[PDB]
């Protein structure tokens, strides 16, 4: 309802410096940034408050499929590991494993997330009982044309939950361009254009895929707002006609080297004005949801080719407003009338000194642990624990799945 938390180093947004300050909190959204020392209710003294994080790429109940499926290609991963597991993937499982992603990724100072998967509407009840915001979307392929009802279950998504509190949207998920047939790809695009919903796909993940891009420009990519993740192998040749369309790279990068695809030439195509934003991906393929190691990664693979790639700057910009943008929330800046999602750092840290470079830590040597996550003027994770679930019946309800699900 209304609160000031602060009298700490308050971080606006990826282009400024920390100032001591407070920030006010009336209704999930920001009333007013304090400067200097204030009346505060929650003293945050020592401590930094920055705007909170958004994954724009992820599967969450595969948590529970985590590390199953090492030292495999891609294709076995999937088609060998993974299907067989998800056939046996309940309602239940689907709630308690995103439960268990919103607590590890809640850990690492993320606000909301784009998930592609099934058993959707599940996910959904657990993002609200959690507190998240969420771009929800259903994965969809077919086999000319027959994709088994999955639309139709995307659909029900979409009117049960889009819009849902201001924290839920719903999208389409066609899994990739090879998966989904021309024309039911086209079907999708159509469908999300109708709605003025999003589209999220894999695209280009693999050295396989060398299909043209036009054949996606002509149904719809240039006016469906669409996160694609991975665009690991997109050519060059098109990243000027990606620049003005609402087209969001969602780069994966422990994913891409994990299951051997490489590293997305992110460098080139933010130089060519292309929108990216980070994604961890599933728990299968990345191990962790943490969206600190991904952009720190991501960091470090683009200045193996030159060290003066992807700045600090950039990389805060990445994690926080651009990700908040491709999810269409009004997040990633710590300013008047914008969301209250928020994330509280410990600057009380070995690795967080000298303290005149705290920015630079944030990217290059902070432990991606946050002191507290804040969504929708609401905590979500504070000092190791979570006020929105009981946590005690997860963790009971998580280690009967485990024996469930793998006898
Ligand atoms: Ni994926």
Redesign the pocket.
Same mark, same amino acid.
């Given at each position: 309802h209304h609160m000031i938390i602060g009298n700490c180093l308050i971080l606006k947004d990826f282009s400024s410096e920390p100032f001591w300050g407070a920030v006010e909190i009336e209704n999930g959204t920001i009333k007013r940034v304090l400067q200097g020392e204030v009346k505060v209710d929650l003293d945050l003294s020592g401590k930094l408050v920055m705007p909170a994080l958004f994954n724009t #790429?992820t #599967?969450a109940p595969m948590t529970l499929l985590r590390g199953v499926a090492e030292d495999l290609s891609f294709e076995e991963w999937l088609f060998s590991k993974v299907l067989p597991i998800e056939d046996r993937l309940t309602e239940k499982m689907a709630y308690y494993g995103t439960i268990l992603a919103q607590m590890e990724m809640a850990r690492h100072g993320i606000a909301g997330f784009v998930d592609?998967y099934f058993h959707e509407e599940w996910i959904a009840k657990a993002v609200r009982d959690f507190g998240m915001r969420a771009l929800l979307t259903r994965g969809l392929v077919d086999s000319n044309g027959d994709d088994g009802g999955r639309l139709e279950e995307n659909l029900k998504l979409y009117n049960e939950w889009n819009g849902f509190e201001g924290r839920i949207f719903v999208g389409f998920g066609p899994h990739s361009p090879y998966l989904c047939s021309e024309e039911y790809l086209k079907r999708v695009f159509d469908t999300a254009k109708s709605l003025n919903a999003p589209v999220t796909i894999?695209l280009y993940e693999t050295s396989k895929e060398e299909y043209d891009l036009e054949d996606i420009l002509n149904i719809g990519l240039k006016e469906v707002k669409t996160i694609a993740?991975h665009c690991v192998h997109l050519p060059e040749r098109y990243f000027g006609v990606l620049k003005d369309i609402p087209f969001f790279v969602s780069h994966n990068p422990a994913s891409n080297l994990k299951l051997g695809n490489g590293i997305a030439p992110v460098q080139r195509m933010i130089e060519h004005g292309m929108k990216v934003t980070l994604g961890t991906?599933?728990a299968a393929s990345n191990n962790s949801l943490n969206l600190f190691f991904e952009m720190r990664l991501a960091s470090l693979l683009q200045k193996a080719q030159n060290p003066r790639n992807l700045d600090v700057n950039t990389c805060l910009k990445m994690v926080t407003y651009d990700g908040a943008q491709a999810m269409g929330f009004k997040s990633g800046k710590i300013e008047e009338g914008w969301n209250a999602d928020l994330v509280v750092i410990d600057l009380d840290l070995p690795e967080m000194f000298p303290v005149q470079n705290i920015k630079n830590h944030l990217v290059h040597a902070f432990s991606g642990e946050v002191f507290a996550t804040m969504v929708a003027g609401k905590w979500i994770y504070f000092d190791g624990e979570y006020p929105t679930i009981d946590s005690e019946e997860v963790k009971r309800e998580l280690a009967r799945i485990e024996k469930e699900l793998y006898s």
């Open positions: #790429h #599967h592609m894999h993740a991906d599933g």
